[PDB]
Amino acid sequence: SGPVPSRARVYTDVNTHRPREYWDYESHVVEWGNQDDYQLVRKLGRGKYSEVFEAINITNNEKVVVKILKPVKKKKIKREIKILENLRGGPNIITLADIVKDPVSRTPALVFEHVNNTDFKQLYQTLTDYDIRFYMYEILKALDYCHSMGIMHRDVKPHNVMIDHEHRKLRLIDWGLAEFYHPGQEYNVRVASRYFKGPELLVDYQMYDYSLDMWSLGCMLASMIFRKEPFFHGHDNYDQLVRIAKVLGTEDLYDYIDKYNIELDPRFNDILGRHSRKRWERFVHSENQHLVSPEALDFLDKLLRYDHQSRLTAREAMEHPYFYTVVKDQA
Ligand SMILES: CC(=O)Nc1cc(Nc2cc(NC3CC3)n3ncc(C#N)c3n2)ccc1C
Numbered sequence: 001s002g003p004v005p006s007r008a009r010v011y012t013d014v015n016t017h018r019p020r021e022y023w024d025y026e027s028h029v030v031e032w033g034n035q036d037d038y039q040l041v042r043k044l045g046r047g048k049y050s051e052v053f054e055a056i057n058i059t060n061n062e063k064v065v066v067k068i069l070k071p072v073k074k075k076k077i078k079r080e081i082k083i084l085e086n087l088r089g090g091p092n093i094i095t096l097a098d099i100v101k102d103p104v105s106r107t108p109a110l111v112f113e114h115v116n117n118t119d120f121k122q123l124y125q126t127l128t129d130y131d132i133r134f135y136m137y138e139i140l141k142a143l144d145y146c147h148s149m150g151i152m153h154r155d156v157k158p159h160n161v162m163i164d165h166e167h168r169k170l171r172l173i174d175w176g177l178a179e180f181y182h183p184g185q186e187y188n189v190r191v192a193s194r195y196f197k198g199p200e201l202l203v204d205y206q207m208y209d210y211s212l213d214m215w216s217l218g219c220m221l222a223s224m225i226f227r228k229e230p231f232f233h234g235h236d237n238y239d240q241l242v243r244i245a246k247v248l249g250t251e252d253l254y255d256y257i258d259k260y261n262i263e264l265d266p267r268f269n270d271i272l273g274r275h276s277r278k279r280w281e282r283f284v285h286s287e288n289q290h291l292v293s294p295e296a297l298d299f300l301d302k303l304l305r306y307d308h309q310s311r312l313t314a315r316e317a318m319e320h321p322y323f324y325t326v327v328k329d330q331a
Contacts, residue, residue: 004260007183008209010313015150015180023150023180025082026075030108033098038066038111049076049176054114057097064097065112076176077108083151083178084110090149092142094162094173115162115171123165124158124224129291130325132224135163137318137326138170139217144314146178147210153178154191156216158223181209194240195219195230199253199306202241203262211308214317218303225291225300226283242271248306249277256306295322 015023037059044052044065053066069077084096098111127135139161146153153160155177162171177191186206192198198215200208222231232247234240245253250272257264280297299322302312312320318327 001261003205003207003262005184006205006207006209006260006309008181008211009309010315011147011150011181011210012183014148015182018150022086023082023182025078025180028078028082030078030081030099033100033111035100035102035109037098038064038100040066047174047176055111057111063114065114067110067112069108069110080110080176080178083175083180086149087146087151087175090142090145092138092170092172093145094171094175112173113171115169115173116164116166117162118165120158120161120163123163124229125227127224129293132221132291133323133326134168135161135170136217136221137323139172139220140314140318142170142172143210143213143217144318146172147181147213147314150181151178152181152210153213155193155196156213156220157193157196158220158229159193161220192216194234194237195232197237197240198308199241199244199256200308202237202244203257203264203268205260205262208308210313211311214303214311214314215308217317218300218311221296221300221303222283225288225296227288227291228283238265238267238271241268242273244306245272246275247278248304250275252277252306259307293322295320298322
Protein backbone atom coordinates (compact mmCIF):
# COMPACT_ATOMS: atom_id res chain seq x y z
CA SER A 1 0.00 0.00 0.00
CA GLY A 2 1.01 3.62 -0.69
CA PRO A 3 1.36 6.62 1.67
CA VAL A 4 -1.40 7.74 4.12
CA PRO A 5 -2.98 11.07 2.98
CA SER A 6 -2.79 14.33 4.97
CA ARG A 7 -4.67 17.64 5.19
CA ALA A 8 -3.55 20.97 6.67
CA ARG A 9 -4.70 21.34 10.32
CA VAL A 10 -5.73 25.00 9.65
CA TYR A 11 -6.81 26.94 6.51
CA THR A 12 -7.53 23.61 4.76
CA ASP A 13 -10.22 24.79 2.29
CA VAL A 14 -9.51 28.51 2.00
CA ASN A 15 -8.75 28.19 -1.80
CA THR A 16 -11.77 25.93 -2.48
CA HIS A 17 -14.05 28.71 -1.13
CA ARG A 18 -12.37 31.31 -3.40
CA PRO A 19 -13.32 31.90 -7.09
CA ARG A 20 -11.21 29.68 -9.51
CA GLU A 21 -9.19 32.73 -10.75
CA TYR A 22 -7.66 33.30 -7.27
CA TRP A 23 -5.46 30.11 -7.46
CA ASP A 24 -5.77 29.05 -11.18
CA TYR A 25 -2.58 30.93 -12.06
CA GLU A 26 -2.21 29.03 -15.41
CA SER A 27 -5.11 31.15 -16.77
CA HIS A 28 -3.64 34.39 -15.28
CA VAL A 29 -3.10 37.25 -17.77
CA VAL A 30 -0.14 39.48 -16.81
CA GLU A 31 -0.54 43.32 -16.51
CA TRP A 32 2.55 44.93 -18.00
CA GLY A 33 4.01 48.31 -17.12
CA ASN A 34 6.42 50.50 -19.06
CA GLN A 35 10.06 49.30 -18.97
CA ASP A 36 11.37 52.90 -19.70
CA ASP A 37 10.08 53.94 -16.24
CA TYR A 38 13.09 52.02 -14.78
CA GLN A 39 16.84 52.58 -15.11
CA LEU A 40 19.18 50.03 -13.55
CA VAL A 41 21.72 51.49 -11.05
CA ARG A 42 23.80 48.48 -9.95
CA LYS A 43 23.71 44.65 -9.57
CA LEU A 44 22.51 43.24 -6.22
CA GLY A 45 23.01 39.54 -6.87
CA ARG A 46 21.53 36.41 -8.46
CA GLY A 47 19.34 33.34 -7.94
CA LYS A 48 18.66 29.97 -9.63
CA TYR A 49 16.16 31.76 -12.04
CA SER A 50 17.25 35.49 -11.93
CA GLU A 51 19.80 38.39 -11.82
CA VAL A 52 18.65 41.14 -9.43
CA PHE A 53 19.44 44.82 -9.67
CA GLU A 54 18.86 48.04 -7.85
CA ALA A 55 16.93 50.51 -10.07
CA ILE A 56 15.41 53.97 -10.16
CA ASN A 57 11.83 54.74 -11.19
CA ILE A 58 12.48 57.95 -13.16
CA THR A 59 8.77 59.02 -12.94
CA ASN A 60 8.83 59.37 -9.09
CA ASN A 61 12.59 59.10 -8.16
CA GLU A 62 11.92 56.00 -5.97
CA LYS A 63 14.47 53.21 -5.32
CA VAL A 64 13.27 49.73 -6.44
CA VAL A 65 14.63 46.14 -6.73
CA VAL A 66 14.46 44.58 -10.28
CA LYS A 67 14.36 40.76 -10.56
CA ILE A 68 15.13 40.00 -14.28
CA LEU A 69 14.12 36.41 -14.95
CA LYS A 70 16.26 33.72 -16.71
CA PRO A 71 14.27 31.14 -18.89
CA VAL A 72 11.45 29.84 -16.62
CA LYS A 73 8.01 28.22 -17.54
CA LYS A 74 5.40 30.98 -18.15
CA LYS A 75 3.10 29.17 -15.58
CA LYS A 76 5.87 29.44 -12.87
CA ILE A 77 6.12 33.25 -13.65
CA LYS A 78 2.24 33.53 -13.51
CA ARG A 79 2.34 31.63 -10.17
CA GLU A 80 4.83 34.11 -8.51
CA ILE A 81 2.96 37.11 -9.98
CA LYS A 82 -0.47 35.77 -8.85
CA ILE A 83 0.75 34.94 -5.28
CA LEU A 84 2.44 38.41 -5.00
CA GLU A 85 -0.70 40.27 -6.16
CA ASN A 86 -2.89 38.13 -3.80
CA LEU A 87 -0.57 38.92 -0.86
CA ARG A 88 -0.23 42.68 -1.66
CA GLY A 89 -0.78 44.88 1.40
CA GLY A 90 -0.35 41.86 3.68
CA PRO A 91 1.73 42.30 6.89
CA ASN A 92 5.53 42.14 6.15
CA ILE A 93 5.03 40.82 2.59
CA ILE A 94 7.24 42.33 -0.12
CA THR A 95 5.29 44.68 -2.41
CA LEU A 96 5.32 43.93 -6.15
CA ALA A 97 5.38 47.43 -7.61
CA ASP A 98 5.46 46.48 -11.34
CA ILE A 99 5.92 43.84 -14.09
CA VAL A 100 7.90 44.89 -17.22
CA LYS A 101 9.26 43.11 -20.32
CA ASP A 102 12.20 44.10 -22.56
CA PRO A 103 10.56 44.88 -26.04
CA VAL A 104 13.69 43.45 -27.78
CA SER A 105 14.99 40.57 -25.43
CA ARG A 106 11.32 39.58 -24.49
CA THR A 107 12.64 38.93 -20.93
CA PRO A 108 10.15 39.56 -18.00
CA ALA A 109 11.30 41.51 -14.90
CA LEU A 110 9.54 41.95 -11.56
CA VAL A 111 9.84 45.33 -9.79
CA PHE A 112 9.77 45.26 -5.96
CA GLU A 113 9.77 47.79 -3.12
CA HIS A 114 13.36 48.34 -1.93
CA VAL A 115 14.41 47.26 1.56
CA ASN A 116 17.63 48.84 3.00
CA ASN A 117 18.90 45.42 4.19
CA THR A 118 21.80 44.70 6.61
CA ASP A 119 23.29 41.32 5.42
CA PHE A 120 22.28 38.51 7.90
CA LYS A 121 25.92 37.27 8.09
CA GLN A 122 26.70 40.67 9.82
CA LEU A 123 23.31 41.66 11.41
CA TYR A 124 22.55 38.35 13.26
CA GLN A 125 25.75 38.52 15.50
CA THR A 126 24.56 42.03 16.72
CA LEU A 127 20.90 41.03 17.53
CA THR A 128 19.73 40.94 21.18
CA ASP A 129 17.35 38.32 22.71
CA TYR A 130 14.61 40.98 22.22
CA ASP A 131 15.65 41.59 18.52
CA ILE A 132 15.34 37.84 17.73
CA ARG A 133 11.82 37.66 19.37
CA PHE A 134 10.71 40.95 17.72
CA TYR A 135 11.84 39.82 14.23
CA MET A 136 10.56 36.23 14.81
CA TYR A 137 7.13 37.76 15.56
CA GLU A 138 7.31 39.83 12.27
CA ILE A 139 7.98 36.72 10.09
CA LEU A 140 5.02 35.03 11.86
CA LYS A 141 2.68 37.91 10.87
CA ALA A 142 3.83 37.29 7.23
CA LEU A 143 3.46 33.43 7.50
CA ASP A 144 0.04 33.47 9.27
CA TYR A 145 -1.16 35.91 6.61
CA CYS A 146 0.12 34.03 3.49
CA HIS A 147 -1.13 30.72 5.07
CA SER A 148 -4.58 32.30 5.84
CA MET A 149 -4.52 33.32 2.13
CA GLY A 150 -4.01 29.63 1.09
CA ILE A 151 -0.30 30.01 0.19
CA MET A 152 2.94 28.32 1.43
CA HIS A 153 6.23 30.24 0.89
CA ARG A 154 8.27 26.94 0.59
CA ASP A 155 11.63 28.86 0.77
CA VAL A 156 11.81 30.45 4.30
CA LYS A 157 15.51 31.09 5.12
CA PRO A 158 17.67 34.09 6.27
CA HIS A 159 18.42 35.18 2.66
CA ASN A 160 14.63 35.63 1.94
CA VAL A 161 14.06 37.82 5.06
CA MET A 162 15.00 41.48 4.31
CA ILE A 163 15.57 43.46 7.50
CA ASP A 164 16.09 47.26 7.69
CA HIS A 165 17.38 47.33 11.36
CA GLU A 166 17.41 51.19 11.61
CA HIS A 167 13.60 51.27 10.97
CA ARG A 168 12.80 47.83 12.61
CA LYS A 169 11.28 46.86 9.24
CA LEU A 170 11.03 43.24 8.02
CA ARG A 171 9.84 41.89 4.62
CA LEU A 172 9.50 38.20 3.58
CA ILE A 173 10.72 38.17 -0.07
CA ASP A 174 11.24 35.80 -3.10
CA TRP A 175 7.93 34.06 -3.62
CA GLY A 176 9.21 32.20 -6.71
CA LEU A 177 8.92 28.79 -4.97
CA ALA A 178 5.57 29.55 -3.22
CA GLU A 179 2.45 27.46 -3.98
CA PHE A 180 -1.30 27.44 -3.28
CA TYR A 181 -2.35 24.80 -0.76
CA HIS A 182 -5.09 22.42 -2.06
CA PRO A 183 -6.24 19.47 0.14
CA GLY A 184 -5.10 16.20 -1.42
CA GLN A 185 -2.44 17.80 -3.70
CA GLU A 186 0.99 16.09 -4.09
CA TYR A 187 3.71 18.72 -4.32
CA ASN A 188 7.30 18.65 -5.57
CA VAL A 189 9.65 17.86 -2.65
CA ARG A 190 12.66 19.34 -4.59
CA VAL A 191 12.01 22.79 -2.98
CA ALA A 192 13.92 24.92 -0.34
CA SER A 193 17.62 25.21 0.53
CA ARG A 194 19.20 21.96 1.85
CA TYR A 195 19.68 23.26 5.45
CA PHE A 196 16.01 24.41 5.69
CA LYS A 197 14.29 21.36 4.05
CA GLY A 198 11.65 19.78 6.33
CA PRO A 199 11.75 16.01 7.12
CA GLU A 200 8.72 15.54 4.76
CA LEU A 201 10.90 16.75 1.77
CA LEU A 202 13.80 14.45 2.78
CA VAL A 203 11.62 11.23 3.07
CA ASP A 204 9.70 12.12 -0.13
CA TYR A 205 6.26 12.74 1.43
CA GLN A 206 4.42 14.83 -1.20
CA MET A 207 1.15 15.64 0.59
CA TYR A 208 2.70 18.40 2.69
CA ASP A 209 1.23 21.84 3.59
CA TYR A 210 1.87 25.20 5.34
CA SER A 211 3.52 23.30 8.27
CA LEU A 212 6.65 23.04 5.99
CA ASP A 213 7.27 26.82 6.55
CA MET A 214 7.13 26.23 10.34
CA TRP A 215 10.09 23.74 10.09
CA SER A 216 12.21 26.30 8.10
CA LEU A 217 11.31 28.97 10.64
CA GLY A 218 12.55 26.59 13.42
CA CYS A 219 15.90 26.11 11.59
CA MET A 220 16.26 29.94 11.39
CA LEU A 221 15.45 30.36 15.16
CA ALA A 222 17.85 27.53 16.16
CA SER A 223 20.70 29.20 14.13
CA MET A 224 19.96 32.64 15.66
CA ILE A 225 19.69 31.67 19.38
CA PHE A 226 22.58 29.18 19.24
CA ARG A 227 24.79 31.24 16.79
CA LYS A 228 25.18 28.00 14.79
CA GLU A 229 24.67 28.61 11.05
CA PRO A 230 23.56 26.28 9.62
CA PHE A 231 21.98 24.42 12.59
CA PHE A 232 21.46 21.15 10.60
CA HIS A 233 24.58 20.99 8.40
CA GLY A 234 23.99 18.15 5.89
CA HIS A 235 26.47 17.20 3.11
CA ASP A 236 23.49 16.34 0.82
CA ASN A 237 19.75 15.63 1.12
CA TYR A 238 20.42 12.15 2.63
CA ASP A 239 22.96 13.41 5.20
CA GLN A 240 20.62 16.34 5.98
CA LEU A 241 18.06 13.82 7.43
CA VAL A 242 20.92 12.13 9.38
CA ARG A 243 21.88 15.59 10.88
CA ILE A 244 18.22 16.16 12.08
CA ALA A 245 18.12 12.51 13.40
CA LYS A 246 21.29 13.11 15.50
CA VAL A 247 19.38 15.94 17.31
CA LEU A 248 15.69 14.79 17.26
CA GLY A 249 16.48 11.05 17.53
CA THR A 250 15.61 8.14 15.19
CA GLU A 251 12.61 6.88 17.26
CA ASP A 252 10.23 9.77 16.33
CA LEU A 253 11.52 9.57 12.72
CA TYR A 254 10.56 5.84 12.39
CA ASP A 255 7.25 6.62 14.21
CA TYR A 256 6.59 9.36 11.57
CA ILE A 257 7.48 6.93 8.67
CA ASP A 258 5.14 4.35 10.28
CA LYS A 259 2.26 6.85 10.77
CA TYR A 260 2.16 7.98 7.13
CA ASN A 261 3.28 4.59 5.65
CA ILE A 262 6.26 6.24 3.97
CA GLU A 263 8.39 4.20 1.52
CA LEU A 264 11.94 5.06 2.70
CA ASP A 265 14.73 5.23 0.10
CA PRO A 266 17.00 2.12 0.76
CA ARG A 267 20.04 4.54 0.91
CA PHE A 268 18.64 5.83 4.28
CA ASN A 269 18.56 2.33 5.89
CA ASP A 270 22.40 2.22 6.21
CA ILE A 271 23.06 5.90 7.17
CA LEU A 272 20.23 6.85 9.61
CA GLY A 273 21.42 4.52 12.34
CA ARG A 274 20.16 4.77 15.93
CA HIS A 275 20.32 8.10 17.73
CA SER A 276 18.74 9.44 20.89
CA ARG A 277 16.73 12.72 21.09
CA LYS A 278 19.19 15.35 22.32
CA ARG A 279 18.49 17.99 24.92
CA TRP A 280 18.82 21.60 23.63
CA GLU A 281 21.39 22.36 26.40
CA ARG A 282 24.20 20.72 24.38
CA PHE A 283 23.94 23.66 21.92
CA VAL A 284 24.14 26.28 24.76
CA HIS A 285 27.55 27.87 25.56
CA SER A 286 28.96 31.12 27.05
CA GLU A 287 28.81 33.07 23.73
CA ASN A 288 25.09 32.32 23.01
CA GLN A 289 23.46 31.76 26.50
CA HIS A 290 22.16 35.42 26.60
CA LEU A 291 19.92 34.48 23.58
CA VAL A 292 18.71 31.11 25.04
CA SER A 293 15.96 31.00 27.70
CA PRO A 294 13.49 28.22 28.77
CA GLU A 295 10.82 30.05 26.61
CA ALA A 296 13.03 29.98 23.47
CA LEU A 297 13.71 26.26 23.94
CA ASP A 298 10.03 25.37 24.52
CA PHE A 299 9.07 27.40 21.38
CA LEU A 300 11.91 25.79 19.31
CA ASP A 301 10.88 22.25 20.36
CA LYS A 302 7.24 22.85 19.24
CA LEU A 303 8.42 23.91 15.75
CA LEU A 304 11.08 21.27 15.09
CA ARG A 305 8.89 18.10 14.95
CA TYR A 306 9.17 15.38 12.18
CA ASP A 307 5.34 15.10 12.07
CA HIS A 308 4.13 18.21 10.23
CA GLN A 309 0.69 17.85 11.85
CA SER A 310 2.21 18.23 15.33
CA ARG A 311 4.24 21.48 14.58
CA LEU A 312 2.79 24.81 15.78
CA THR A 313 0.77 26.90 13.30
CA ALA A 314 2.03 30.53 12.72
CA ARG A 315 -0.99 31.71 14.83
CA GLU A 316 -0.28 29.19 17.64
CA ALA A 317 3.42 30.27 17.52
CA MET A 318 2.44 33.97 17.95
CA GLU A 319 0.70 33.00 21.24
CA HIS A 320 3.82 31.37 22.72
CA PRO A 321 5.20 32.84 26.05
CA TYR A 322 8.44 33.64 24.08
CA PHE A 323 6.54 36.65 22.49
CA TYR A 324 4.74 38.00 25.65
CA THR A 325 7.09 41.08 25.86
CA VAL A 326 6.86 41.84 22.07
CA VAL A 327 2.99 41.50 22.20
CA LYS A 328 2.77 43.86 25.28
CA ASP A 329 5.18 46.37 23.57
CA GLN A 330 3.02 46.45 20.39
CA ALA A 331 0.00 47.79 22.42
C1 LIG B 1 14.26 39.80 -5.88
C2 LIG B 1 14.10 38.42 -5.31
O1 LIG B 1 13.01 37.92 -5.10
N1 LIG B 1 15.25 37.71 -5.17
C3 LIG B 1 16.54 38.09 -4.73
C4 LIG B 1 16.74 39.29 -4.05
C5 LIG B 1 18.04 39.74 -3.80
N2 LIG B 1 18.28 40.94 -3.11
C6 LIG B 1 17.43 41.89 -2.56
C7 LIG B 1 18.06 42.94 -1.89
C8 LIG B 1 17.33 43.98 -1.32
N3 LIG B 1 17.90 45.01 -0.59
C9 LIG B 1 19.34 45.09 -0.32
C10 LIG B 1 20.18 45.94 -1.18
C11 LIG B 1 19.89 46.35 0.22
N4 LIG B 1 15.92 43.91 -1.53
N5 LIG B 1 14.93 44.73 -1.01
C12 LIG B 1 13.77 44.17 -1.46
C13 LIG B 1 13.97 42.98 -2.16
C14 LIG B 1 12.99 42.13 -2.76
N6 LIG B 1 12.19 41.46 -3.22
C15 LIG B 1 15.37 42.79 -2.15
N7 LIG B 1 16.10 41.82 -2.71
C16 LIG B 1 19.12 38.98 -4.22
C17 LIG B 1 18.91 37.81 -4.93
C18 LIG B 1 17.63 37.37 -5.26
C19 LIG B 1 17.43 36.09 -6.03
